[PDB]
Design an enzyme around this catalytic site. Structure first.
Site, PDB file in Angstrom:
ATOM      1  N   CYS A  87     -10.325  -5.087   5.115  1.00  0.00           N
ATOM      2  CA  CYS A  87     -10.369  -4.158   6.131  1.00  0.00           C
ATOM      3  C   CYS A  87      -8.967  -4.423   6.909  1.00  0.00           C
ATOM      4  CB  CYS A  87     -11.486  -3.568   6.642  1.00  0.00           C
ATOM      5  SG  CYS A  87     -11.088  -2.363   7.843  1.00  0.00           S
TER       6      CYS A  87
ATOM      7  N   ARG B  97      -9.716  -3.515  11.318  1.00  0.00           N
ATOM      8  CA  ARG B  97     -10.744  -4.076  12.334  1.00  0.00           C
ATOM      9  C   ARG B  97     -10.334  -4.308  13.515  1.00  0.00           C
ATOM     10  NH1 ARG B  97     -12.095  -9.088   8.845  1.00  0.00           N
ATOM     11  NH2 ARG B  97     -10.144  -8.590   7.585  1.00  0.00           N
TER      12      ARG B  97
ATOM     13  N   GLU C 193      -2.204   4.423   1.953  1.00  0.00           N
ATOM     14  CA  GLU C 193      -3.335   4.915   1.071  1.00  0.00           C
ATOM     15  C   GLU C 193      -3.127   6.207   0.268  1.00  0.00           C
ATOM     16  OE1 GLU C 193      -7.371   3.727   2.551  1.00  0.00           O
ATOM     17  OE2 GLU C 193      -6.278   3.983   4.588  1.00  0.00           O
TER      18      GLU C 193
ATOM     19  N   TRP D 282     -10.120   6.541   9.828  1.00  0.00           N
ATOM     20  CA  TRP D 282      -8.927   7.355   9.413  1.00  0.00           C
ATOM     21  C   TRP D 282      -7.938   6.631   8.615  1.00  0.00           C
ATOM     22  CZ3 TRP D 282     -10.059   5.993  14.570  1.00  0.00           C
ATOM     23  CH2 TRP D 282      -9.261   4.877  15.150  1.00  0.00           C
TER      24      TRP D 282
HETATM   25  C1  HEM Z   1     -10.760   3.180  11.806  1.00  0.00           C
HETATM   26  C2  HEM Z   1      -9.606   3.305  10.968  1.00  0.00           C
HETATM   27  C3  HEM Z   1      -9.675   2.354   9.907  1.00  0.00           C
HETATM   28  C4  HEM Z   1      -8.663   2.105   8.955  1.00  0.00           C
HETATM   29  C5  HEM Z   1      -7.078   2.489   9.221  1.00  0.00           C
HETATM   30  C6  HEM Z   1      -9.091   1.171   7.813  1.00  0.00           C
HETATM   31  C7  HEM Z   1      -8.265   0.712   7.082  1.00  0.00           C
HETATM   32  C8  HEM Z   1      -8.688   0.287   5.623  1.00  0.00           C
HETATM   33  C9  HEM Z   1      -8.106  -0.107   4.451  1.00  0.00           C
HETATM   34  C10 HEM Z   1      -6.547   0.605   4.184  1.00  0.00           C
HETATM   35  C11 HEM Z   1      -8.758  -0.435   3.542  1.00  0.00           C
HETATM   36  C12 HEM Z   1      -8.223  -0.911   2.117  1.00  0.00           C
HETATM   37  C13 HEM Z   1      -8.953   0.203   1.221  1.00  0.00           C
HETATM   38  C14 HEM Z   1      -8.310   0.355  -0.191  1.00  0.00           C
HETATM   39  O1  HEM Z   1      -7.390  -0.094  -0.543  1.00  0.00           O
HETATM   40  O2  HEM Z   1      -9.114   0.977  -0.992  1.00  0.00           O
HETATM   41  C15 HEM Z   1      -9.799  -0.817   4.069  1.00  0.00           C
HETATM   42  C16 HEM Z   1     -11.137  -1.500   3.556  1.00  0.00           C
HETATM   43  C17 HEM Z   1     -12.317  -1.561   3.945  1.00  0.00           C
HETATM   44  N1  HEM Z   1     -12.613  -1.072   5.213  1.00  0.00           N
HETATM   45 FE1  HEM Z   1     -11.433  -0.231   6.693  1.00  0.00          FE
HETATM   46  N2  HEM Z   1     -10.625   1.123   7.936  1.00  0.00           N
HETATM   47  C18 HEM Z   1     -10.849   1.771   9.239  1.00  0.00           C
HETATM   48  C19 HEM Z   1     -12.119   1.929   9.535  1.00  0.00           C
HETATM   49  C20 HEM Z   1     -13.354   1.264   8.695  1.00  0.00           C
HETATM   50  C21 HEM Z   1     -14.579   1.323   9.197  1.00  0.00           C
HETATM   51  C22 HEM Z   1     -14.990   2.473  10.500  1.00  0.00           C
HETATM   52  C23 HEM Z   1     -15.372   0.775   8.326  1.00  0.00           C
HETATM   53  C24 HEM Z   1     -16.851   0.579   8.234  1.00  0.00           C
HETATM   54  C25 HEM Z   1     -17.634   0.712   9.485  1.00  0.00           C
HETATM   55  C26 HEM Z   1     -14.428   0.077   7.403  1.00  0.00           C
HETATM   56  C27 HEM Z   1     -14.909  -0.676   6.313  1.00  0.00           C
HETATM   57  C28 HEM Z   1     -13.978  -1.401   5.292  1.00  0.00           C
HETATM   58  C29 HEM Z   1     -14.519  -1.794   4.150  1.00  0.00           C
HETATM   59  C30 HEM Z   1     -16.013  -2.388   4.064  1.00  0.00           C
HETATM   60  C31 HEM Z   1     -13.276  -2.185   3.012  1.00  0.00           C
HETATM   61  C32 HEM Z   1     -13.342  -2.862   2.101  1.00  0.00           C
HETATM   62  C33 HEM Z   1     -13.582  -1.899   0.957  1.00  0.00           C
HETATM   63  C34 HEM Z   1     -13.630  -2.623  -0.513  1.00  0.00           C
HETATM   64  O3  HEM Z   1     -13.673  -3.866  -0.612  1.00  0.00           O
HETATM   65  O4  HEM Z   1     -13.236  -2.031  -1.519  1.00  0.00           O
HETATM   66  N3  HEM Z   1     -13.150   0.409   7.937  1.00  0.00           N
HETATM   67  N4  HEM Z   1      -9.811  -0.164   5.600  1.00  0.00           N
HETATM   68  N1  LIG Z   2     -13.388  -0.674  -9.699  1.00  0.00           N
HETATM   69  C1  LIG Z   2     -13.490   0.300  -9.525  1.00  0.00           C
HETATM   70  N2  LIG Z   2     -12.665   1.273  -8.782  1.00  0.00           N
HETATM   71  C2  LIG Z   2     -12.319   0.998  -7.487  1.00  0.00           C
HETATM   72  C3  LIG Z   2     -12.994  -0.227  -6.780  1.00  0.00           C
HETATM   73  C4  LIG Z   2     -12.813  -0.359  -5.594  1.00  0.00           C
HETATM   74  C5  LIG Z   2     -11.889   0.229  -4.647  1.00  0.00           C
HETATM   75  C6  LIG Z   2     -11.669   0.357  -3.428  1.00  0.00           C
HETATM   76  C7  LIG Z   2     -11.683   1.660  -2.745  1.00  0.00           C
HETATM   77  N3  LIG Z   2     -11.923   1.611  -1.314  1.00  0.00           N
HETATM   78  C8  LIG Z   2     -11.928   3.010  -0.692  1.00  0.00           C
HETATM   79  C9  LIG Z   2     -11.685   2.683   0.780  1.00  0.00           C
HETATM   80  C10 LIG Z   2     -12.645   1.774   1.221  1.00  0.00           C
HETATM   81  C11 LIG Z   2     -12.454   1.453   2.545  1.00  0.00           C
HETATM   82  C12 LIG Z   2     -11.527   1.898   3.525  1.00  0.00           C
HETATM   83  C13 LIG Z   2     -10.650   3.063   2.523  1.00  0.00           C
HETATM   84  N4  LIG Z   2      -9.682   3.523   3.846  1.00  0.00           N
HETATM   85  C14 LIG Z   2     -10.042   4.154   4.920  1.00  0.00           C
HETATM   86  N5  LIG Z   2      -9.047   4.372   5.905  1.00  0.00           N
HETATM   87  C15 LIG Z   2     -11.326   4.195   5.491  1.00  0.00           C
HETATM   88  C16 LIG Z   2     -12.534   4.712   4.921  1.00  0.00           C
HETATM   89  C17 LIG Z   2     -13.495   4.758   5.580  1.00  0.00           C
HETATM   90  O1  LIG Z   2     -13.104   4.155   6.799  1.00  0.00           O
HETATM   91  N6  LIG Z   2     -11.673   3.827   6.607  1.00  0.00           N
HETATM   92  C18 LIG Z   2     -10.503   3.349   1.532  1.00  0.00           C
HETATM   93  C19 LIG Z   2     -11.324   1.461  -5.468  1.00  0.00           C
HETATM   94  C20 LIG Z   2     -11.722   1.835  -6.856  1.00  0.00           C
HETATM   95  C21 LIG Z   2     -14.552   1.100 -10.630  1.00  0.00           C
HETATM   96  C22 LIG Z   2     -14.169   1.726 -11.640  1.00  0.00           C
HETATM   97  C23 LIG Z   2     -15.569   2.033 -12.328  1.00  0.00           C
HETATM   98  O2  LIG Z   2     -16.229   1.793 -11.352  1.00  0.00           O
HETATM   99  N7  LIG Z   2     -15.754   0.830 -10.454  1.00  0.00           N
HETATM  100 CL   LIG Z   3      -8.887   6.976  -0.453  1.00  0.00          CL
END
Ligand code: HEM
Ligand SMILES: N=C(Nc1ccc(CCNCc2cccc(NC(=N)c3ccon3)c2)cc1)c1ccon1
Ligand SMILES: [Cl-]
Ligand code: HEM
Ligand SMILES: N=C(Nc1ccc(CCNCc2cccc(NC(=N)c3ccon3)c2)cc1)c1ccon1
Ligand SMILES: C[C@H](O)[C@H](O)[C@H]1CNc2nc(N)[nH]c(=O)c2N1
Ligand SMILES: C[C@H](O)[C@H](O)[C@H]1CNc2nc(N)[nH]c(=O)c2N1
Ligand SMILES: [Ca+2]
Ligand SMILES: [Ca+2]
Ligand SMILES: [Ca+2]
Ligand SMILES: [Cl-]
Ligand SMILES: [Gd]
Ligand SMILES: [Gd]
Ligand SMILES: [Zn+2]
Lengths: 404, 403
Positions: free
Chosen positions: A108, A111, A285, A280
């Site tokens: 993330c 953070r 993304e 947000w």
């Molecule tokens: C407030 C603005 C926030 C921004 C701009 C942001 C941005 C991002 C981005 C760009 C990613 C990569 C996601 C991807 O490529 O699919 C990510 C991952 C992640 N975010 Fe943040 N986030 C925000 C808030 C949060 C909040 C509020 C939480 C939880 C309370 C959170 C928890 C996570 C987690 C757990 C991941 C890892 C997802 C994974 O491993 O697939 N984020 N975030």
């Molecule tokens: N590997 C598989 N796909 C797969 C696995 C992992 C991912 C990671 C996608 N994270 C979506 C995501 C996660 C966290 C943050 C954001 N963004 C924010 N801004 C945000 C969202 C909430 O707060 N802030 C977006 C996406 C696709 C799969 C195929 C079949 O089963 N699994």
């Molecule tokens: Cl998305």
């Protein structure tokens, strides 16, 4: 030794002493690094060690370590585990734990915000209908008419003798993906499976590229139940470009609120399989991954052709030029609609400030370089030149198997 | 035990069985991954590495375990008993140099690994002969702009004797001069070597693109200063196809990337001086060397000339300026008839290399962070490819600076 970590832009050096505390194991060994893998992975005494560690973290956070209250809460958790095999978080511990799980999330970049999180306690939830009410309240709060606010709602914890609460959708707002017979897809290919499940469970589908899916909500020991979101709750942004007027005729849109709903939240050894969180968007993304990935909406070539680019040779850099303009449209469109969004330069700059805060506060910060560096313009951002140490701390957000 | 590896664009799965053969140990543990670190590493032993390299060699020419195989093993044993080291056959050296390239996890250009010109300079003595070997390498490799990959191997490290070393990190580098406003005129990466050339008696220039002299060190002597003949150093003035003012910025870069500070390891033997050259990928010049904040850092200059809005990041002025600098690099090299590859073509070729290596060896060591280009990452196919990183030998390795 503790790992030495270098910023190559500035030459500055730190040591990640926090990583020595990492408990759960990652996939790497001295023989080979698997840092690039998307999925790095896949009882009273072990529960207590995790609970004790968490309580210790809580009392540290409020500057009361070793207090009478600290010792008494440890004993109180020990007694509940001895009696019942499990325990319950205090309300204050739940709020702290969810913020910590966010703080600990290595992928993330957002953070810097981790201490500003609205935590909705839904641990009294007893049905799928009440789940839907909690979710609608979450969406209304977090959306806030475009002035987005970070939030999490925590549904009841996993426990033996009862099924889990689960949200089957990967996010609260998602566009349908209709698998065509030729193998092509209308809509978002990332959502083909959940679209087919919504249909299989009685949803009447559309035929658009941006059809908002219903929610499939699972209460304990029940098949999922279908709930449609109120249209007035789902804020969307039509995409236009500030100087390419034909861009609007592409008919592109995206939704305001990213709200991840399929991850498991782990706090002090307790597991919360349903705990959707939202913040947000960072503009890459939407503009780079969601719209330009070959396996998502895949619009890069259409835009490049409209821009009159030479798509017959790689060396014209038509892909790079088209992607830049799509990202500009996303940013311009969200700002015009007054919906919170952050560009990848500002996001990564704020993440560097977060690393410095965390070095002072805890002696390090778990960070997954490949996910922190944006998917375009990588070395134009400061995080590219920052070495990072990836490891797993708890409280944590974790992947979990799809419930079907 | 065999890692599963997935491509997320296509869905295909492979298993990396070659990683089980990883000879040395990397920096990661189950507790924490250090993959993003630039520097992962801080008698009887020589024989075992020597043995297993000879085994590799004969397997690769389908002479596994046969007659000549046993003879070569016994020769190396007698050699190290008499001298404490041994000599490679010229063909073993060629094979070891190619393997060390093939094994380099951070190299996106390894589709070319089988085509490498090896110049055997192991009979070298004195810096003056080094300079002649190097000049011949440069002339061969530049080839008037039709670049050809080449390595020159100088004598190996041996007991009781110093090393040959090239003090410069590359055969062609631009000077970097400090000023009393703290800043650097020229390339900030080369400030250290620039003041070393000045110390050892080089009259400095005052330009941003002054080609440095060579500081060549023969065993147990001070390094000697050598000037490269100007007609040997092919340079490319940078212009843009449509932005007429770009030429007036006075930017230049050189044709030949020739890395001269890495150590070549083959069969337990070590060559601290073994410069190698290929050709550039455009992002190396246009994104890293020209746009890094700690290099020439020209991005805001170009954006100002493009009349972009530099007061908000959300205009993406950095991204637009970066693309046009890369365009200028590609256009300028192509116009000058100097070999160059753009990052889209290079990453597509590396995907073919991954498929070839799957069939040939069951895997391929690859460092994701270095294989994915520094702009347009996810627009290239390597972004969506999971990779396994591990150390094989023969290898190119970092080594301490000679000073
Ligand atoms: C407030 C603005 C926030 C921004 C701009 C942001 C941005 C991002 C981005 C760009 C990613 C990569 C996601 C991807 O490529 O699919 C990510 C991952 C992640 N975010 Fe943040 N986030 C925000 C808030 C949060 C909040 C509020 C939480 C939880 C309370 C959170 C928890 C996570 C987690 C757990 C991941 C890892 C997802 C994974 O491993 O697939 N984020 N975030
Ligand atoms: N590997 C598989 N796909 C797969 C696995 C992992 C991912 C990671 C996608 N994270 C979506 C995501 C996660 C966290 C943050 C954001 N963004 C924010 N801004 C945000 C969202 C909430 O707060 N802030 C977006 C996406 C696709 C799969 C195929 C079949 O089963 N699994
Ligand atoms: Cl998305
Ligand atoms: C022929 C065209 C070639 C291309 C396009 C190419 C491309 C690249 C690129 C872009 C890098 C990243 C370097 C950086 O970002 O600093 C790299 C690294 C590397 N290359 Fe290649 N290369 C080529 C030829 C060669 C040859 C001929 C050799 C050796 C015989 C070689 C050995 C290496 C090694 C060892 C590295 C690792 C550098 C390090 O870890 O610092 N390459 N290559
Ligand atoms: N170690 C220092 N920095 C440092 C450390 C490592 C690096 C890695 C850069 N590799 C240069 C390089 C290597 C390999 C390929 C290319 N490119 C080609 N295309 C090519 C070249 C030959 O064939 N093909 C370029 C750069 C700087 C330091 C610290 C203080 O002082 N110096
Ligand atoms: C193979 C690779 O790990 C995979 O495609 C990763 C790379 N880095 C990423 N980084 C972010 N932010 N999001 C992603 O989905 C990915 N995908
Ligand atoms: C911190 C990080 O490891 C460092 O900046 C790396 C990242 N990836 C890279 N990739 C390439 N091709 N070249 C580099 O110099 C680097 N630098
Ligand atoms: Ca109780
Ligand atoms: Ca002064
Ligand atoms: Ca202006
Ligand atoms: Cl270079
Ligand atoms: Gd226009
Ligand atoms: Gd002007
Ligand atoms: Zn690792």
């Amino acid at each position: 030794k503790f790992p030495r970590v270098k910023n190559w832009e500035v030459g500055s050096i730190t040591y990640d002493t926090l990583s020595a505390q990492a408990q759960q194991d990652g996939p790497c060994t001295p023989r080979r690094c698997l840092g690039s893998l998307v999925f790095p992975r896949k009882a009273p005494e072990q529960l207590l060690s995790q609970a004790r560690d968490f309580i210790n973290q809580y009392y540290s956070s409020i500057k009361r370590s070793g207090s009478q209250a600290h010792e008494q809460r440890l004993q109180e958790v020990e007694a509940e585990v001895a009696a019942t095999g499990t325990y319950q978080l205090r309300e204050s511990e739940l709020v702290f734990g969810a913020k910590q799980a966010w703080r600990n999330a290595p992928r993330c970049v957002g953070r810097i915000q981790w201490g500003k999180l609205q935590v909705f306690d839904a641990r009294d939830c007893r049905s799928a209908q009440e789940m839907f009410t909690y979710i609608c309240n979450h969406i209304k709060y977090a959306t806030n008419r475009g002035n987005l606010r970070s939030a999490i709602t925590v549904f009841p914890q996993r426990c033996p003798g009862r099924g889990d609460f689960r949200i089957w959708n990967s996010q609260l707002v998602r566009y349908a993906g209709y698998r065509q017979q030729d193998g092509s897809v209308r809509g978002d290919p990332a959502n083909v499976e959940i679209t087919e499940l919504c249909i299989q469970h009685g949803w009447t589908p559309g035929n658009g590229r941006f059809d908002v899916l219903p929610l499939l909500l699972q209460a304990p020991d029940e098949p999922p139940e279908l709930f449609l979101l109120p249209p007035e709750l789902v804020l969307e942004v039509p995409l236009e470009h500030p100087t390419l007027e034909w861009f609007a005729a592409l008919g592109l849109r995206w939704y305001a609120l990213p709200a991840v709903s399929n991850m498991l939240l782990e706090i002090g050894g307790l597991e919360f399989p349903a705990a959707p969180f939202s913040g947000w968007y960072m503009s890459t993304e939407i503009g780079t991954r969601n719209l330009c990935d070959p396996h998502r909406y895949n619009i890069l070539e259409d835009v490049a052709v409209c821009m009159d680019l030479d798509t017959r040779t790689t060396s014209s850099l038509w892909k790079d030029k088209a992607a830049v303009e799509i990202n500009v449209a996303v940013l311009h469109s969200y700002q015009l609609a007054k919906v919170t969004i952050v560009d990848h330069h500002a996001a990564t700059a704020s993440f560097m400030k977060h690393l410095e805060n965390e070095q002072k506060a805890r002696g390090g910060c778990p960070a997954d370089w490949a996910w922190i560096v944006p998917p375009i313009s990588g070395s134009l951002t400061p995080v590219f030149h920052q070495e990072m140490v990836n490891y797993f701390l708890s409280p944590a957000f974790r992947y979990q198997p799809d419930p079907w």
